[PDB]
Design brief:
Family (chain A): Belongs to the actin family.
Largest sheet of chain D: 6 strands, mixed
Helix content of chain D: 25-40%
Largest interface: B-D, 24 and 43 residues
Distance between the termini of chain D: 21 Å
Number of domains of chain D: 3
InterPro entries (chain A): Actin, ATPase_NBD
Strand order of the largest sheet of chain D: 3-2-1-9-10-18
Largest sheet of chain C: none
Structural class of chain D: alpha+beta
Structural class of chain C: mainly alpha
CATH architecture of the largest domain in chain D: 2-Layer Sandwich
Shape of chain D: globular
Oligomer: part of a larger assembly
Helix content of chain C: over 70%
Strand content of chain D: 15-25%
Chains: A alpha+beta (387), B alpha+beta (53), C mainly alpha (75), D alpha+beta (392)
Order of helices and strands of chain D: EEEEEEEEHEHEHEEEEHHEEHHEHHHHEH
Organism (chain A): Saccharomyces cerevisiae (strain ATCC 204508 / S288c) (Baker's yeast)
Main location (chain A): nucleus
Strand content of chain C: under 5%
GO molecular function, one term (chain A): chromatin binding
Shape of chain C: rod-shaped
Chain lengths: 387, 53, 75, 392
């Protein structure tokens, strides 16, 4: 292998992952946001939750990555200083950099802002940019339908023979952060509670709301149908003599008030149902904004035979993302299988690593040849600067 | 002599941490790494004070 | 001649794309197997120290037992 | 390898524990404790020289490790050499055939701190192979030494220093770097006490903390007042203050432990960690401290039915109550069980048990053929990068 060590940085819209290419896990996972506390001042890092709990006026949380998965506040992003100084503890000038979403091709202005940050400001020697869905897939698949369910929403990316099909790239608007909103709005009356108030929203999202989500389930089949069925069955057990699974209760200790919150299994299934049938919150969302219909992306892949691309993609489905860990892959599969009955689906997923699979992808910086990736040097920048 | 004590115990290359410029000829960029060098490239304290007693 | 040269050159581009795609998979598969190996050798070292501990504990117990046995029957 | 020859060094901000040779019968608590500092004379022309004493009052006093972090890597390596050389001289006198026996092949185990750079770890590796001309090196993280001293696959290390406390979760025998953190320790107790006892001074307050009558509560506790003796033999009486001063620290550590373990993603790992809390460091030898810290983690974090809620349900059933089951993983919290079969260690307490971790690892590793966990000359011949092929 090569005599080098890279810094690997992944700026997700929610989490930022950083570490060296020579070890199996990242040195740090910190928030892709910061507190601006006021003489101004900028707080980064997960525990630095301390400041949020202080509940101090003028403290406000701002974000670095828009819903595109792309950095939009570049003065703030230059976070990088914080990473290099306090976490990796190395001059940014020494080592090659590897950083990471699939696009339709237009915003790809970004490359320039990266030159300015990597070169004009940090003095990085050289950097590679990997495309997240592509790297994750490579980290043994050259062709794959990559279904990434993150905080910003679902990102669906067909990748055929190492190439990304940009016009078939599709980004849902409903994911993890959306789930935070719904958990909050729904539980509001039991916990008393029912921008500028960013600090508390953030702190709650990062504490009890995060635990609550980890402890939600996704129903295997359209929930409204599951209900009608379970009812229809329940009637017969009852009538027959003279247990509906949705009546099981789940208990969550809510710490801020030392108070138990109990949901029935249906109410637990309900939250993720919105990702699939978002027409159930507002009348302003079409069923087509739902993850299942969002089929659309494969069919748009077939427009580069089609019943071949369909077959390739569907035998290499990759499910990834923090939110994809919510109990109940099976619904994404059921949802895919019924839009494409003629084909056999085979899906792959890290069963451990998915929360940071994007960073894990970029890491697999351990490719044996310099010719395997485009590596931008200070040169490239100079030459772009000409007319 | 401490240096000779070091020399007589435990019985051979040396590395430096320096700029390196890979090739395909040479790529346009540099980066620091641990390169192997070519052919051409005080006191003593008394334990017992520090022994616990 | 012109057509074959163009087609052959295009095929050579295809082989470069293919070897590159393949090379990256080979690197990828090897890296994954290395992660599993490290994880295993680690878990294996840990699980052995437990056994080492058990033997250190048995040895001590024998030692202490021989000590107490003489101690309790002699002034 | 010869057991006579194994060298363990455990450098910390104030002092450095050292041992050369393992006893073979049972493990002994390290007897060498060298203050962690070196003198740095500056020689006109720019360069530096390093001595054990202020040479003719010409040298400056460098303290290389602060808050556990290496702040001066050059003085730190000079300090290792100073230790290492001293050991060679000592043994070389006493026995004179030493260079053919005890000093012929010296493997080194250096206990590292979570905060050390990769850059620092490589430089140290280079120093050990090139300057000290040693041939075999393990760099063992402090956290792992801890867990190896009945080998726990999942646990949390709470290492209470003087000015900072490290919190370090271990899952599947691996230190979880992105969860690791320190809070800015023992001095806090001193400070709490100064506020409670204004008319005392520093040495008086430090003496109380180190006395038999200072404990954290959660027979001495029976007496309103009690007595203890100055560093200079002066008798001092004290009331309820001797059961105070540890609280602010205990709460701070606990809040941190909670945020940390809550970010362990595999709920099944998490449960295991919470059941193997390991507390280490000088402070922890204060009578009552560990149990008090446990008590607080319970009070703050345990998954259990709120008492009022439970009291209603029991009234309702007056007209047997089943246990409410929660979906939260951490429903049980425990301190990890110490091994009771290291007699010398039992005798002296386990505040420094990290070192026993290293005695065990080094014997394992160095008295068995496999070279999987340390850098050898062979390997050194990748250089310092060799280090990353034997990480645990």
């Amino acid at each position: 292998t090569l005599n080098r060590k890279c810094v690997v940085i992944h700026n997700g819209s929610h989490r930022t992952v950083a570490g060296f290419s020579n070890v199996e896990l990242p040195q740090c996972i910190i928030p892709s946001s910061y507190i601006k506390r006021t003489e101004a001042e900028f707080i980064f890092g997960t525990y630095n939750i301390d400041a949020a709990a202080e509940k101090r006026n003028g403290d406000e949380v701002y974000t670095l990555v828009d819903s595109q998965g792309l950095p939009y506040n570049w003065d703030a992003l230059e976070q990088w200083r914080y990473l290099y100084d306090t976490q990796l503890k190395v001059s940014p000038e020494e080592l090659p950099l590897v950083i990471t979403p699939a696009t339709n091709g237009k915003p790809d202005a970004i490359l320039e802002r990266y030159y300015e940050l990597a070169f004009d400001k940090l003095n990085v020697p050289v950097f590679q940019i990997v495309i997240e869905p592509l790297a994750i897939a490579l980290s043994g698949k050259s062709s794959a339908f990559v279904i990434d369910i993150g905080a910003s929403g679902c990102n669906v990316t067909p990748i055929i023979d190492g190439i990304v099909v940009k016009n078939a790239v599709v980004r849902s608007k409903f994911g993890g952060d959306f789930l935070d909103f719904q958990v909050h709005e729904r539980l509001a009356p039991l916990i008393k509670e029912e921008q500028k108030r960013s600090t508390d929203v953030w702190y709650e999202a990062s504490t009890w709301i995060q635990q609550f989500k980890s402890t939600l389930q996704v129903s295997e089949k359209d929930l409204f149908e599951l209900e009608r069925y379970y009812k229809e069955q329940a009637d017969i057990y009852a009538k027959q003599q003279e247990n509906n699974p949705l009546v099981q209760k789940k208990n969550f200790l809510f710490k801020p008030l030392n108070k138990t919150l109990t949901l029935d299994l249906k109410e637990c299934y309900q939250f993720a149902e919105y990702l699939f049938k978002p027409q159930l919150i507002s009348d302003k969302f079409s069923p087509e904004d739902g993850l299942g219909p969002l089929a659309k992306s494969v069919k748009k892949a077939g427009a580069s035979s089609p019943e071949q691309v369909y077959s390739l993609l569907l035998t290499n489905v990759i499910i990834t993302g923090s939110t994809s860990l919510i109990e109940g892959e099976q619904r994404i599969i059921k949802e895919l299988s019924i839009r494409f009955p003629q084909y056999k689906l085979t899906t792959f997923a890290n069963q451990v690593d998915r929360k940071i699979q994007g960073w894990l992808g970029a890491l697999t910086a351990n490719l044996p040849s310099w010719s395997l990736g485009k590596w931008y040097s200070k040169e490239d920048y100079e030459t772009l600067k000409r007319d | 002599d401490p240096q000779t004590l070091i020399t007589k115990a435990n019985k051979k290359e040396s590395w430096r941490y320096d700029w390196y410029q890979p090739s395909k000829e040479k790529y346009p960029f540099r980066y620091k790494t641990w390169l192997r060098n070519q052919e051409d490239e005080e006191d003593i304290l008394d334990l017992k004070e520090f022994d616990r007693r | 001649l012109y057509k074959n040269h163009e087609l052959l050159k295009l095929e050579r581009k295809k082989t470069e794309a293919v070897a590159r795609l393949k090379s990256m998979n080979k690197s990828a598969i090897n890296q994954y197997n290395r992660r599993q190996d490290k994880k295993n050798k680690r878990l294996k070292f840990g699980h052995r120290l437990i056994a080492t501990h058990t033997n250190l504990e048995r040895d001590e117990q024998k030692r202490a037992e021989k000590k107490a046995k003489e101690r309790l029957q002699a002034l | 390898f010869r057991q006579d020859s194994i060298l363990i060094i455990y450098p910390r901000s104030q002092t450095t524990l050292v041992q050369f040779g393992l006893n073979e019968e049972t493990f002994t608590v390290p007897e060498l404790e060298i203050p962690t500092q070196i003198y740095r004379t500056t020689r006109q022309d720019g360069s530096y020289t390093y001595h054990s004493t202020n040479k003719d009052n010409k040298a400056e006093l460098i303290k290389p490790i602060q808050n556990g972090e290496i702040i001066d890597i050059s003085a730190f390596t000079q300090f290792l050499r100073l230790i290492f050389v001293s050991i060679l001289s000592d043994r070389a006198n006493k026995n004179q055939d030493a260079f053919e026996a005890e000093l012929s092949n010296i493997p080194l185990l250096l206990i590292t701190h979570h905060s050390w750079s990769q850059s620092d770890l490589e430089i140290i590796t280079q120093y050990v192979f090139e300057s000290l001309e040693i041939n075999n090196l393990i760099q063992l993280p402090a956290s792992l030494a801890a867990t190896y001293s009945i080998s726990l696959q999942n646990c949390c290390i709470i290492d209470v220093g003087t000015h900072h406390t490290d919190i370090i979760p271990i899952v599947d025998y691996a230190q979880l770097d992105h969860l690791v953190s320190s809070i800015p320790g023992g001095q806090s107790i001193n400070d709490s006490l100064k506020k409670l006892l204004p008319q005392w001074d520093d040495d008086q307050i430090e003496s109380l903390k180190k006395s038999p009558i200072f404990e954290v509560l959660s027979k001495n506790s029976d007496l309103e007042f009690n007595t203890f003796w100055d560093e200079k033999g002066n008798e001092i009486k004290v009331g309820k203050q001797r059961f105070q001063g540890c609280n602010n620290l205990i709460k701070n550590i606990s809040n941190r432990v909670g945020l940390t373990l809550d970010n362990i993603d595999d709920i099944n790992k998490a449960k295991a960690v919470w059941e193997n809390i390991i507390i280490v460091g000088g402070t922890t030898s204060i009578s009552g401290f560990k149990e008090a810290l446990l008590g607080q983690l319970l009070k703050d974090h345990l998954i259990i039915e709120p008492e009022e809620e439970k009291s209603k349900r029991e009234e309702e059933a007056k007209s047997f109550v089943p246990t409410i089951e929660y979906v939260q993983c951490p429903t049980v919290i425990k301190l990890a069980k110490y091994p009771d079969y290291f007699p010398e260690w039992k005798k002296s307490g386990y505040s420094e048990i990290i070192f026993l971790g290293a005695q065990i690892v080094s014997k394992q590793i160095f008295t068995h053929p496999k070279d999987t966990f340390y850098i050898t000359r062979e390997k050194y011949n990748k250089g310092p990068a060799a280090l990353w092929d034997v990480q645990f």
